[PDB]
Amino acid sequence: IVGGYTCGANTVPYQVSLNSGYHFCGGSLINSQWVVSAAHCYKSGIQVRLGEDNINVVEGNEQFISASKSIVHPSYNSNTLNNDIMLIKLKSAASLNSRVASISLPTSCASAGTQCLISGWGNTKSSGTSYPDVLKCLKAPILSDSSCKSAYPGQITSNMFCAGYLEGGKDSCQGDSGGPVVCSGKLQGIVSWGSGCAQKNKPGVYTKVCNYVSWIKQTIASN
Numbered sequence: 001i002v003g004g005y006t007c008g009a010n011t012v013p014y015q016v017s018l019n020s021g022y023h024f025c026g027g028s029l030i031n032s033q034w035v036v037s038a039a040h041c042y043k044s045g046i047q048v049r050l051g052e053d054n055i056n057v058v059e060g061n062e063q064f065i066s067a068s069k070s071i072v073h074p075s076y077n078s079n080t081l082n083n084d085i086m087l088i089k090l091k092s093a094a095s096l097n098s099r100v101a102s103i104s105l106p107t108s109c110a111s112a113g114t115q116c117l118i119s120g121w122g123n124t125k126s127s128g129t130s131y132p133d134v135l136k137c138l139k140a141p142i143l144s145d146s147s148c149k150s151a152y153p154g155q156i157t158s159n160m161f162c163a164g165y166l167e168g169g170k171d172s173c174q175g176d177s178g179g180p181v182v183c184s185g186k187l188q189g190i191v192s193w194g195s196g197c198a199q200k201n202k203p204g205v206y207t208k209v210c211n212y213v214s215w216i217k218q219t220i221a222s223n
């Protein structure tokens with residue numbers, strides 16, 4: 001997160017870190033046994049780390065649980081990043097509490113102008129590299145479909161939306177991928193892509209979660 005703020009420990013209780021020896025992507029806990037993340041975050045050997053603030057210190061609220069199964073969206077295209085969504089089942093159910101909690105799925109899509117909370121352990125510089133140890137947050141609005149498409153000609157599908165600031169300086173970044181965009185208490189996006197980070201006229205692009213709720217629910221029901 002570029003241009004954000006320190007969230008506070010366990011104030012984003014659905015935020016997870018995906019770990020393969022090191023943090024490499026975020027994710028969102030959607031029930032005791034399932035995480036949603038970005039398909040471009042897929043790898044084997046994932047440990048899901050819940051209840052994290054400092055990803056380099058054991059602080060006392062962590063739950064570390066191996067993935068038992070990963071499911072990349074059937075229509076994920078890694079070239080275009082269309083359908084940049086994947087589900088991860090945990091080998092055991094998380095113990096839900098005040099600091100480890102699921103986030104609601106949307107019942108309807110969000111609109112342009114809605115403020116959202118984006119979070120992650122990604123890069124904090126736009127012309128540099130600095131990775132935080134503690135969770136960073138950004139409040140950002142959803143941008144209109146027309147401004148999103150104008151920012152990124154020929155690249156925005158109906159499964160993507162833009163959020164952030166066309167002026168630059170405030171965005172998600174490398175290492176935030178897969179993490180949440182929550183608007184009025186609903187998971188509306190997944191950190192997906194963008195040109196650089198926090199660049200003028202190049203807002204963040206997010207997977208449009210509301211298009212996938214049917215798939216999510218049926219997949220959970222059968223796995």
Ligand SMILES: [Ca+2]
Nearest residue numbers: 054057058059
């Ligand atoms: Ca920790």
